[PDB]
From a paper:
To understand the molecular details of the Red1-Pla1 interaction, we determined the crystal structure of the complex. Co-crystals of the complex appeared within three weeks and diffracted to 2.81 Å resolution. The asymmetric unit contains two molecules of the Pla1-Red1 heterodimer which exhibit small differences between them, as indicated by a root mean square deviation (RMSD) of 0.96 Å. Our crystal structure of the Pla1-Red1 complex shows that Red1 contacts the C-terminal RRM domain of Pla1. The interaction between Pla1 and Red1 buries a total solvent accessible area of 1338.5 Å2. The interaction interface of Red1 can be largely divided into two regions. The first half comprises a short α-helix at the N-terminus (α0) that helps orient Red1 onto Pla1. A network of aromatic stacking interactions occurs between Pla1RRM Phe468 and Red1 Trp298 and Phe305. The second half of Red1 is largely involved in mainchain-sidechain interactions between Red1 residues Gly306, Ser308, Asn311 and Val312 that pack against Pla1 residues Gln420, Val518, Ile520 and Asn522. In addition to these, the Red1 C-terminus, spanning residues 323–345, is flexible and therefore not observed in the crystal structure of the complex.
The S. pombe orthologue of the human PAXT connection, Mtl1-Red1 Core (MTREC), is an eleven-subunit complex that targets cryptic unstable transcripts (CUTs) to the nuclear RNA exosome for degradation. It encompasses the canonical poly(A) polymerase Pla1, responsible for polyadenylation of nascent RNA transcripts as part of the cleavage and polyadenylation factor (CPF/CPSF). We report crystal structures of Pla1 in its apo form and in complex with Red1. Taken together, our data reveal the molecular details of recruitment of Pla1 by Red1 which leads to hyperadenylation of CUTs, serving as a signal for exosome-mediated target degradation.
Author numbering:
A (entry chain A): 11 to 451, 477 to 492, 498 to 551
B (entry chain C): 288 to 322
């Protein structure tokens, strides 16, 4: 019709039939029955919190500017604006979900002023509790809970001497004079905005992303750190289907989502807009000349400059899992559109611990809980490096990483017994199950991750080389010492799986 | 004077290595003793 969304003409501009619109009402009703819509009183609280954090940013930049001997007029008009991105700005977020915030300041407020001046401004503010402002080891990030609302603040330094109260990060010229670390930060909110503008109907895009993100979480194909696409990645995938069906309702989008994507001839990338060149001369994802961007299995390119592949972590094994989970979800999507299945049938839990014969048990142990959290985060981060080395053997045809990890606390008696727990030997020892840090500032805390295996297939298999590389890769961490932390890998058959991986009532594999 | 607590502090500040590692090995492509 009179509208052309996306980089290709749509598949069908047809309106929604009475059945499609009725199924859409059933889809939204099912999403509400899972408490995926938060509450009107809680969203009003997030708005008052963000406006409260915006008043602090003006107070923050004004104090740092006066310390640089700025005039009464310049320090007043220096400004400083806070932005948001991620699940919150897309409008798709459940209760308790964190608000991915981002602070923008002029260049005269350095990253040193971000941790030295803003952190005390938050504690003295009587509404901030559990503030864990970690000095930058990766990206300048600060986590806290303003009025109970969890916030993840990311620093960004602009070269422009003043940031007005009504600034928009759409102009590509603002990236000039900004360090590469602070450029990728701004790219988070630039892509979140570009997504909401390249879709025909925004309301249809939000309901569809709710069901697709929920389905991905319920099947453990949502974690980015292990090789599965992230939230922004899934948002761009449902955005592309919304473009091809402009006047369709959310139920139609979800049903057509699984079919179109698993039959998509990869690695033909998904683009929400034609890739635009910019001022800075940096890589802009061209698989024809860059061999690194060519090897991307399922490329999903962000529409904001510079255009990067959000799904570059995807390996051969993760790709096969995503394609197979899309095929199953599609068949369910086809039978719910004919009223042969309820919408709740799509959000069924995964069956990871019943799909493979051999599971690779990967645990990380430490003496204290503070060290355990830091150590468990790094071992999980290096998990995608292990499946890539396990794919090279191809006596293993598939190395499926698992989403989360199981935390158990051992209460050892003797010092010689804790050294066994810290190793592959696990006797009959008491293991309490926990989630996170305790005490609020001989026990051995562990965190177990799994990797499913499908074997290609003579008499035995030796994965000693990838496991040894994984050991050195985790112990190369600069914040590590073998006096407190350790990591080991073990084998586990179907029958040898622990009781923790099964919820009450499940049938363990008896083979 | 708390002897159990002193042994805990000695356990935290212990400079001895925490555990060890071993190479892994999976047995059979499972043509015998199938599921």
């Amino acid at each position: 019709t009179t509208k052309q969304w996306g980089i290709t003409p749509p598949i069908s501009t047809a309106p929604a039939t009475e059945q499609e619109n009725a199924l859409n009402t059933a889809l939204i009703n099912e999403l509400k029955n899972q408490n995926l819509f938060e509450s009107p009183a809680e969203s009003e609280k997030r708005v008052k919190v963000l406006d409260e954090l915006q008043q602090i940013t003006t107070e923050f930049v004004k104090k740092v500017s006066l310390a640089k001997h700025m005039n009464e007029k310049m320090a007043n008009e220096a400004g400083g604006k806070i932005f948001t991105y991620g699940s919150y700005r897309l409008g798709v977020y459940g209760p308790g979900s964190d608000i991915d915030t981002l602070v923008v300041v002029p260049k005269h407020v350095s990253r040193d002023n971000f941790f030295q001046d803003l952190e005390p401004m938050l504690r003295e503010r009587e509404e901030v509790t559990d503030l864990a402002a970690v000095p930058d080891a990766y990206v300048p990030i600060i986590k806290f809970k303003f009025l109970g609302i969890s916030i993840d603040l990311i620093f960004a330094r602009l070269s422009v001497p003043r940031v007005p109260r009504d600034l928009e990060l759409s102009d590509n010229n603002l990236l000039k004079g900004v360090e590469e670390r602070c450029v990728l930060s701004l790219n988070g909110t630039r892509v979140t905005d570009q997504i909401l503008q390249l879709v025909p109907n925004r309301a249809v895009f939000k309901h569809a992303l709710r069901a697709i993100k929920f389905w991905a979480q319920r099947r453990a194909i949502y974690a980015n750190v292990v090789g599965f696409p992230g939230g922004v990645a899934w948002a761009m995938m449902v955005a592309r289907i919304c473009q091809l069906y402009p006047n369709a309702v959310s139920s139609v989008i979800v049903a057509k989502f699984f079919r179109i994507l698993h039959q998509w001839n990869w690695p033909q990338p998904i683009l929400l807009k034609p890739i635009e060149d910019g001022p800075l001369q940096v890589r802009i994802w061209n698989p024809k000349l860059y061999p690194s961007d060519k090897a991307h299995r399922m490329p999903i390119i962000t529409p904001a400059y510079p255009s990067m592949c959000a799904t570059h972590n995807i390996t051969l094994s993760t790709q096969t899992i995503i394609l197979r989970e899309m095929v199953r979800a599609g068949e369910i999507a086809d039978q719910i559109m004919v009223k042969a299945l309820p919408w709740s049938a799509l959000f069924q839990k995964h069956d990871f611990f019943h799909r493979y014969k051999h599971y690779l048990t990967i645990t990380a142990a430490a003496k204290t809980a503070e060290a355990q959290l830091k150590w468990a985060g790094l071992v999980e981060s290096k998990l995608r490096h292990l499946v890539t080395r396990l794919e090279l053997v191809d006596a293993i045809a598939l190395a499926h990483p698992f989403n989360k990890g199981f935390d158990k606390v051992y209460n050892c008696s003797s010092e010689e017994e804790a050294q066994q727990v810290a190793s592959g030997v696990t006797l009959e020892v008491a293991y309490e199950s926990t989630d996170h840090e305790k005490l609020a500032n001989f026990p051995v805390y562990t965190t177990t991750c799994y990797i499913g295996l499908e074997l290609e297939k003579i008499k035995r298999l030796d994965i000693s080389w990838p496991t040894q590389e994984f050991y050195e890769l985790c112990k190369k961490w600069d914040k590590y010492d073998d006096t407190l932390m350790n990591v080991f890998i073990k084998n586990t058959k179907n029958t040898a799986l622990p009781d923790e991986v099964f919820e009450p009532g499940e049938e363990r594999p008896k083979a | 004077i708390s002897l159990p607590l002193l042994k805990q502090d000695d356990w935290l500040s212990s400079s001895k290595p925490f555990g060890s590692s071993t190479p892994n090995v999976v047995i059979e492509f499972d043509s015998d003793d199938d599921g």
